[PDB]
């Protein structure tokens, strides 16, 4: 029945149980702290079977003042997370308790965080083409349905605003809800994010889960699993496609290596856990789409010391489809998406899938931009006057296309006042086909900033 603690070494806790009450791997244990000034309860998880009715466990919360011989009880079940329709109205961590108030309780249903990937037989044999409202991403870096895509950038490059735009666009166009999971996220940044989401009136249909650094690595390694568990619950219960957000993967790998080296195992491969691919596969195998419902995920990975051959980035890159890059020179140019078309690519771009004309237009655009970039040196050193007619006309077409490639978004009305618009792929490809000839070289520079379709832009230009 009850159990007694034997030895205590930091967060590692050893427990001893009677003969007929040995628990199974990955169970929950509850304990209390007697001291008044540090009154608290501790939860522990089973990870090893040392034998002789001895179990080694990891504390989920910081330990202090623990006393030997204190009785411990067993939950009889693994980590439980609450699911229901009342979710996505508030914020809460991996433990499940809401931070704003403890009002939410056990009324909702409870599920185990541990699951298994779906079978091989019922896997979707064919991929789908996921369309968005932004022309640049559809034309240059097509999005695969149910895949994984990486985003690179920093602060001041308009990535948070783009995330909000994507959240509201997926909420409004195709319905469904998106959950946010922050692992290793600073508390001040989390509070600012909560305030921004609340002020945008889109916090209603989003479930926010946070991971604090002050917690031991157990939260840092289980928050992602909890987020995926609730996302799968929503997908399989409501039939609505969900969008999953992960801030970083590097901290997850660091937490894995930490919990590995704390158990007294053997390090290998530049101070890394020997089976990191096992954890990576177990995490990534439950993101594929099935049964006609899609689960798209967004990640932002960090490269250490500008190295690409490091084992952790190498393992991460094994499950990637598209990459997006942002810079500041494009920001200095003054366009909205702030993405470099030359530094990003997609693995689904094939002439037999997206049409031959799309591939031809993309190749023409890339060639024009590359020639413009190559001739920037001569433009800086001598100018356009010395350049011949062909060079000057291609430069004009390139700069006009660059100005045209920007598209007005919706939440940009917070500083401009004009909601954005969505355009079909056919209109965009036909517009780029007609622009391939550069017939609009006589247009003034200001008229080339897009707001929507092409007829409205032509009318506005004629209204200048």
């Amino acid at each position: 029945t009850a159990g007694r603690v034997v030895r205590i070494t930091g967060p590692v806790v050893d427990v001893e149980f009677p003969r007929g009450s040995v628990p199974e791997l990955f169970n929950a244990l509850h304990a209390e702290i007697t001291f008044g000034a540090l009154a608290k309860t501790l939860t522990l998880e089973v990870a090893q079977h040392l034998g002789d009715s001895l179990v080694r466990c990891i504390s989920m919360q910081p330990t202090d003042g623990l006393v030997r011989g204190v009785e411990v009880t067993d939950t009889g079940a693994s980590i439980s997370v609450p699911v229901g329709d009342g979710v996505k109205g508030h914020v809460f961590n991996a433990l499940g308790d809401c931070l704003d108030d403890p009002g939410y309780g056990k009324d909702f249903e409870h599920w185990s965080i541990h699951r298994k990937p779906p079978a091989f037989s019922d896997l979707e044999p064919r991929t789908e083409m996921l369309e968005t409202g932004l022309k640049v991403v559809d034309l240059l870096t097509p999005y695969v349905r149910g895949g994984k895509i990486a985003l690179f950038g920093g602060a001041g490059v308009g990535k948070t605003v783009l995330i909000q735009e994507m959240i509201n666009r997926i909420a409004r166009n195709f319905g469904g809800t998106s959950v946010f999971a922050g692992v290793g996220e600073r508390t001040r940044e989390g509070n600012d994010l909560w305030v921004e989401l609340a002020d945008a009136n889109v916090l209603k249909d989003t479930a926010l889960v946070f991971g604090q650094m002050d917690e031991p690595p157990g939260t840092r390694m289980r928050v992602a699993l909890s987020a995926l568990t609730m996302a799968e619950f929503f997908r399989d219960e409501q039939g609505q496609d969900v969008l999953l957000f992960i801030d970083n993967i590097f901290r997850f790998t660091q937490a894995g290596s930490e919990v590995s080296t704390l158990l007294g195992r053997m390090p290998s491969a530049v101070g890394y856990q020997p089976t990191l691919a096992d954890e990576m596969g177990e995490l990534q195998e439950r993101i594929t789409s099935t049964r006609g419902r899609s689960i798209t995920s967004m990640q932002a990975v960090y490269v250490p010391a500008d190295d690409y051959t490091d084992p952790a980035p190498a393992t991460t890159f094994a499950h990637l489809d598209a990459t997006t890059e942002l810079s500041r020179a494009v920001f200095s140019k003054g366009i909205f998406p702030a993405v470099d078309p030359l530094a990003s690519s997609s693995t689904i771009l094939d002439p037999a899938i997206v049409g031959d004309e799309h591939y031809r237009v993309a190749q023409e655009v890339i060639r024009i931009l590359q020639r413009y970039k190559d001739l920037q040196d001569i433009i800086a050193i001598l100018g356009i006057d010395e350049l011949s007619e062909e060079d000057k006309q291609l430069v004009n077409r390139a700069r006009r296309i660059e100005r045209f490639l920007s598209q007005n978004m919706m939440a940009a009305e917070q500083f401009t006042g004009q909601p954005g618009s969505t355009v079909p792929l056919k209109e965009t490809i036909e517009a780029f086909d007609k622009l391939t000839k550069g017939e609009f070289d006589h247009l003034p520079e200001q008229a080339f900033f897009l707001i929507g379709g092409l007829d409205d832009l032509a009318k506005k230009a004629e209204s200048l």
Binding site: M266, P267, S268, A269, V270, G271, A305, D307, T309, D310
Partner: protein
């Protein structure tokens, strides 16, 4: 006029040596770090 192009091409060719040598130095330092940690752990566990 012929003189200018020589220096331009010299700069153009000089960039790649920098790139390659930086890559080689990165690989060498990574190898030394991993081998030293491996050997110290191997010395530690055996006793």
């Amino acid at each position: 006029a012929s003189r200018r192009r020589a220096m331009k091409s010299a700069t153009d060719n000089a960039d790649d040596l920098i790139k390659a040598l930086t890559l080689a130095a990165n690989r060498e330092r990574q190898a030394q770090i991993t081998q030293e940690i491996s050997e110290i752990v191997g010395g530690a566990n055996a006793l």
